[PDB]
Amino acid sequence: GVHHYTIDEFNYYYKPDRMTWHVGEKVELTIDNRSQSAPPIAHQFSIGRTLVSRDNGFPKSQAIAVGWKDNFFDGVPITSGGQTGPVPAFSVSLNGGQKYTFSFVVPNKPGKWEYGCFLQTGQHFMNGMHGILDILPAQ
Template sequence: MSKVPNEPPIESPEPQQPEWSRRQFLVGTAAIGVAGAVTLFGRQSLVNAARSVFGSPVSSGTVHLYAYDYYYIPNYMTWRVGDRMEVIFQNQSHTHWHEWTMGRHVNEAYFQAFGNLPADAWQEDFWDGVPVTLSDPYGIDNFVPNQAIVTYVGPKAAYNIQSGGDFSPTLKPGGSLHLSFTVPNKPGLWDFGCFVQQYIHYRTGMRGQVMILPA
């Protein structure tokens, strides 16, 4: 190099090149921005819209319901009144108890409270008056039948039946339970969730929905 170090390099004039398009740039980046915003904020709306337009497949027969640390898979199901169902509920957590309760109208305001929490749950329990058969219990912490009409397969001791609160099988880490029932005539949208640890699981998003279609 034959220049003083702080000297600029020998400048060669710029060749005439076609400019990239300003309009392409603006439209392209704006489109990418919109697509980004939709993927960040609009996924649930897209899913809901798709569900309301196309519906979602009805599950019947044997269905797996997995509980993880603080979510369910699946968290949305569609059932049809009169279908015979067997839900295999399985707790996949390594560390935490999880339960499966289902109902309507939970008083969320209670859940925001600090200090002494009221023991509240669903105002309407889905399982009220529903005949259900439980089988293959493994790692059950406790089971509250509430108003359901329950048939137990095998020795009852394995279910650790207790009272108080909603219909709720509570599983230890790795536990599982089969619930067989005919979908009762209670059409509409039902919520399910896990109220373990003072509702914290529910409050942190361990919840789902079941859409029950009329027969």
């Protein structure tokens, strides 16, 4: 069967902030921007490894997140409504009140991955907008 997952976006966190999938699992994932502010703000959902932060040669208490070096969805074919196929640099960016539902098969990329939002120059990420995805080997 296809397993349905939802990740809700709020300022500035995901619910849930942990998720576990198995290699080979059929996933239908809905990302929903439930931004609660006046006005509601855009949010990103990107899954990857190896945090990249701003350079400037001076030390920081919090690094200003800018992206992931390794994108979990690299190579991964996805279906969303009428469209099927891999999506280059796949990321989900949504305005407040918008959602996006897509399906795929979990690739053989076992271990720990992270999800995050890099909008507003890393400020959301700094405010806690990140989560952990564990990928288990096939049952």
